[PDB]
Amino acid sequence: LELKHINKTTDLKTDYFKPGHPQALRVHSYKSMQPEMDRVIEFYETARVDGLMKREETPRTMTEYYQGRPDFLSYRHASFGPRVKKLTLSSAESNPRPIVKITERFFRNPAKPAEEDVAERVFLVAEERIQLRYHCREDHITASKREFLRRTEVDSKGNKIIMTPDMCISFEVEPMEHTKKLLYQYEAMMHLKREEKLSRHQVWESELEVLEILKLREEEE
Amino acid sequence: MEPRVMDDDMLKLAVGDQGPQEEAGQLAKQEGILFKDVLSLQLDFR
Amino acid sequence: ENQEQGKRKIAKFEEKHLSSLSAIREELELPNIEKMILECSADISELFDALMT
Amino acid sequence: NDIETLKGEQMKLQGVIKSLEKDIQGLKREIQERDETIQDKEKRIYDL
Amino acid sequence: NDIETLKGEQMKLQGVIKSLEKDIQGLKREIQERDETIQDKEKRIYDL
């Protein structure tokens, strides 16, 4: 621990650290030591393996800024909902916040075309939609946009819900004939459902990492 | 036996028999692999 | 030189027009929607004149 | 035994769907027998 | 993994069993509907 700056007017405590930490702490700005409060945690890219820069945690949302990731992921943001009142568990570890929204913004991949490289990917979990905004080509202003209504595999009557073209809404600058195919969009659903599950798991892992960081800082203090 | 010579009829026959699929999946394959746009052909053991 | 200037003007218009589209998709009042679509078209004409010049 | 029972799971998911379809196929045969009843009465009305 | 796929196979086996249960009762109501129509039009036969 190098520096501790306490601003009494805002009751703000900021800890400036040094390289070489097990969790690679650089900056920890907070007002209270309790979890699920307003805090900013800044890390080191050379010492972290996920390339994470920044995590701003609010009582309702979490935000992660990355750098140098092989999948070009740069931005993650998950909005949580209110907790259902379960009378048997009162711990934040045992009662995670239900994930409502996830938004992942990815760096531009030069190996991919702009209309196929996903610039932004939004999972509305509660309403069950997935929205893709692709990267913008240099000879265009607006970008390709696609909307998908993620339906449950089983309906209310026990039948498998088969894919229909009316569900998929795609705004394309140039209309690709291969993106209107029903098979390509179905493989897109499979990949996007897998990515939504992976993103929710990664957000839960980030919350557990925040809890571990807070426990380690409490032990150090 | 007679070695028959390779034509469009058994080409589309192999396109048919490579994937059983479903009905909406079959329409998806119709949009995906047209006779101009067949991604892969398998004609082994004929 | 001229290509770099055009690229910078294109980038500035891209940022402004993306903000304008975000203003499109959140507005609830019809005269406001029509008026800011009109100023979007005015911005399009301005960028067209910029690249012509 | 994992692969066979997962394969048994997938056919049984198709079995539930096709049984729902086989209900409709069973109705189609009974519609034909209804039409056979339709066909014999109109022939006797026409013979009338 | 073998056990939970076998459990899933059993509860989906209930799925066709209840879906077939709708089938025979669906068959038997239309069986009477065919027979009632034949009984009405064989009365028409006695009229002819």
Curated annotation (Swiss-Prot), chain A:
Q: Which residues of the full protein are shown?
A: 487 to 707 of 874
Name assigned to this protein: Dynein regulatory complex subunit 7
Coiled-coil residue spans: 202-221
Quaternary organization: Component of the nexin-dynein regulatory complex (N-DRC). Interacts with TCTE1/DRC5. Interacts with DRC3 and GAS8/DRC4.
Q: What does this protein do?
A: Component of the nexin-dynein regulatory complex (N-DRC) a key regulator of ciliary/flagellar motility which maintains the alignment and integrity of the distal axoneme and regulates microtubule sliding in motile axonemes. Involved in the regulation of flagellar motility. Essential for male fertility, sperm head morphogenesis and sperm flagellum formation.
UniProt source species: Homo sapiens (Human)
**Localization terms from the record:** Cell projection, Cilium, Flagellum; Cytoplasm, Cytoskeleton, Cilium axoneme; Cytoplasm, Cytoskeleton, Flagellum axoneme
Q: Which family does it belong to?
A: Belongs to the DRC7 family.
From Swiss-Prot, chain C:
Q: What is this protein called?
A: Dynein regulatory complex subunit 3
Task: Give the similarity note.
Answer: Belongs to the DRC3 family.
Cell compartment(s), UniProt: Cytoplasm, Cytoskeleton, Cilium axoneme; Cell projection, Cilium; Cytoplasm, Cytoskeleton, Flagellum axoneme; Cell projection, Cilium, Flagellum
What residue ranges are annotated as transmembrane?
A: none
Q: What is its biological role?
A: Component of the nexin-dynein regulatory complex (N-DRC) a key regulator of ciliary/flagellar motility which maintains the alignment and integrity of the distal axoneme and regulates microtubule sliding in motile axonemes.
| Record text on subunit structure and interactions | Component of the nexin-dynein regulatory complex (N-DRC). Interacts with DRC1. Interacts with TCTE1/DRC5. Interacts with DRC7.
* Organism name: Homo sapiens (Human)
From Swiss-Prot, chains D, E:
The portions of this protein that span the membrane are none
> What is its subcellular localisation?
Cytoplasm, Cytoskeleton, Cilium axoneme
- Describe how expression is induced or repressed: May be an IRF6-target.
Q: Tell me which tissues or organs this protein is expressed in.
A: Expressed in nasal epithelial cells.
Look up the record and name the associated disease. Answer: Spermatogenic failure 95: An autosomal recessive, male infertility disorder characterized by markedly reduced progressive sperm motility and multiple morphologic abnormalities of the flagella, including irregularly shaped, short, absent, coiled, and bent flagella.
Q: What does this protein do?
A: Associates with components of the nexin-dynein regulatory complex (N-DRC), a key regulator of ciliary/flagellar motility, and might act as an inner dynein arm (IDA) hub or linkage.
Q: Which family does it belong to?
A: Belongs to the CFAP57 family.
| Subunit structure as annotated in this protein's UniProt entry | May form homodimers. Associates with components of the nexin-dynein regulatory complex (N-DRC) and the CFAP184:CFAP263 complex.
What is the protein name given in its UniProt record? Cilia- and flagella-associated protein 57
**Which residues of the full-length protein are shown here?**
915 to 962 of 1250
